[PDB]
Amino acid sequence: EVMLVESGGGVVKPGGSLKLSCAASGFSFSTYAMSWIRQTPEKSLEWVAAISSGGTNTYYPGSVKGRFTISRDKAMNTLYLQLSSLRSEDTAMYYCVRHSGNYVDSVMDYWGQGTSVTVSS
Amino acid sequence: QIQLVQSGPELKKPGETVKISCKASGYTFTDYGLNWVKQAPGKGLKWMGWINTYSGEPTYNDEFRGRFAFSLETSTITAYLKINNLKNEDTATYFCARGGNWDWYFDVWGAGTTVTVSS
């Protein structure tokens, strides 16, 4: 069935960069919109990035605009979220989530496992 | 004061990429867009395409589809223009005009960087 595993998360220094990658396998990939979701250690979820089905529309919130670049891969069947110019409030656990339809207006059906991106030292 | 001072004139040969800056000053940057206008010597003003001043997502004209890129830096107030793989058709002056997000008249203009290309 549908399985979502992540990669890339670890320790970065403030002002550094990282690139998470979410291998999706178990469904026809390029007809479902996917998003990334982070979780601050106070356990309060929020979006950080969202792409549509065809990869033509990306939406980011006001806090991480311009420095989080989501991107889709159709060949290797993955999904990328490139973090850059990280602050100290970006310590979270980043879930790779899948919507239901071909847009970001659907319900988040299947969530990933979540890798921890701590920003210190 | 309200002005948009650009960089100086350039001199490239065919095969290189030129970069033209356009630094806005005096007014708050994220109110209006930024539009680029190319004027060859002896021709009218061709609108190259605008750029949003909050997100940086451009919108190119269909004529200048490839070879052009409106990158935006937000730490300094500066909108760039990168012309890739220069031919001899891109010898012109390149204004940057403050066109609105609801009005689309070009109120305050820049000066112009007369990029010329030869062997």
Added chain:
Amino acid sequence: TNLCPFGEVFNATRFASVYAWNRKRISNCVADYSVLYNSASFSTFKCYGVSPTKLNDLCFTNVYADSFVIRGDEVRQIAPGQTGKIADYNYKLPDDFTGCVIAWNSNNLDSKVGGNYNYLYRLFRKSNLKPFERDISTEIYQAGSTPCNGVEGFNCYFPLQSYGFQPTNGVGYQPYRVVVLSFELLHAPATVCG
């Protein structure tokens, strides 16, 4: 072959707000709806009585095209049968509607970081709206027992509220430019064929 102006209603720098939409009667075409169908920039292409992949093999009489700007979470109310605060006081579609409702995200234009209060929408009305009826009656509701004489106050309640648009609202509160085609086959010769 001469294509007919879908480029005047889809490519416009300013759509009118939903309390006064602009109807453009398109006739005497050889139209092409498959250019619309294969554009990959529309987030909602839902046809309600025609098979959308076979739109060229039909002849209509008049192809009307309404156009307005609403929130993303309110394009569910531009379907036949659904109701709400948009579908009953601003733009009401009939239940025997035969058309295609097209919409896309438009946060590049209709949103300004201090606010973009140019788009309005009707807040209340005395009754609902019959299908394809607009109401430009921008005057005081005047509840109570005293005439307001054109001001806003304790019993006045001006019925046009402004969309507060920003680039930071959420994807559902970002402005979605809706354009709804309405095909019609009345008893006449057919012109818009393809």
Added chain:
Amino acid sequence: QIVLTQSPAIMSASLGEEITLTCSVSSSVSDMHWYQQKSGTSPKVFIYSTSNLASGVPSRFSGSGSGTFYSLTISSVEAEDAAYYYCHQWSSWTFGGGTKLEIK
């Protein structure tokens, strides 16, 4: 803009009682989804479009409501359902506060 506030953050019921979890919205949204995150796993979806039950969920969770007040009522809570509950709609950019449910 939109604030999704759930009150209170900790709600407690013994096994055999009916408990309800609310999720107030600032302005008017159309629907609202309901998730559950346990203590140490990813969140899963329980209710989508305010009334439909997800795949493989029990038939005790039942939510309803429209406008600016959405609810999730558990008919007979057992000891298994002890986890956080977040509500999120399309137009928010942020999830709910998270109503913890603990047994008594």
Added chain:
Amino acid sequence: EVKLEESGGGLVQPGGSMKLSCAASGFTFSDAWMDWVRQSPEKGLEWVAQIRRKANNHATYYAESVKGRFTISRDDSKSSVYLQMNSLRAEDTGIYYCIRGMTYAMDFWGQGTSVTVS
């Protein structure tokens, strides 16, 4: 968010006067038809006074029992509504709420401070 405080909590001898104050915060004060509503356990909920917003030139309206004994006035600099009452009677015991805008949206009552007579 929006909160509204009150003041003037105390008891008078019959025939005195007090001044109530309602400090508001969290919203645009210059457009709000702010009222004052009393509640007594023997008569129920009543209505005291009203001051309108600046666009209607700060009009005032009172009930039948307080015309001449109460006087409401606002000042947008401090975001405050004042209820100046004079020559109180024996029936004037009750809590006194403060209301942002009555019978529309943005309707948030205050908390109230009890003023009674001896």
Added chain:
Amino acid sequence: DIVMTQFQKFMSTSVGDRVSITCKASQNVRTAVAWYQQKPGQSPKAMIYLASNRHRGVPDRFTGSGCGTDFTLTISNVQCEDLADYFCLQHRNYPLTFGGGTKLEIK
């Protein structure tokens, strides 16, 4: 002035039924009636403005309508958090008269 009466000073129910509180007008008030809910020990929170619309944060259960003389607020699926006093105000002309009130009890 214009008095509003309220025939029911006590409406008792159980959890999950429907109660319909009424509020008659003296003369014809058009639609300018509001409703309020006062939990004991609090300040009243508004629920219905202009006799048919609802506030922000009030559930789907508290619905109400009426025109002319009769105005009814009907609540559905009565929880245990709906023991309160329920008032009705008319604001047709400037003597603004509240209703009597209705205190509920769950048996």
Added chain:
Amino acid sequence: DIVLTQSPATLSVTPGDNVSLSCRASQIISNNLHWYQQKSHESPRLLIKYASQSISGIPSRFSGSGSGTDFTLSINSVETEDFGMYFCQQSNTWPLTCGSGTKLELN
């Protein structure tokens, strides 16, 4: 794309006369046309916005009118500091196309 041809190609006047430029569109641009003024190798200036209104800073003689597809710019009491090139620019449909411009010179 919308084309805006301008008649004639050039003018030739003397100061103290009334002139009339013209910018005839192709499709129907409902008063979404702005007029510019550009001298030799410097940035253009906005003259009138939305084809009938006027901005601050310009003199009181640059006033144009018209709607539909045909617009006119008219200067009365022209001076010896107003010779140059004048462009129109539509704003209704994408992309925004300017005109080839008329050259106003002096005899």
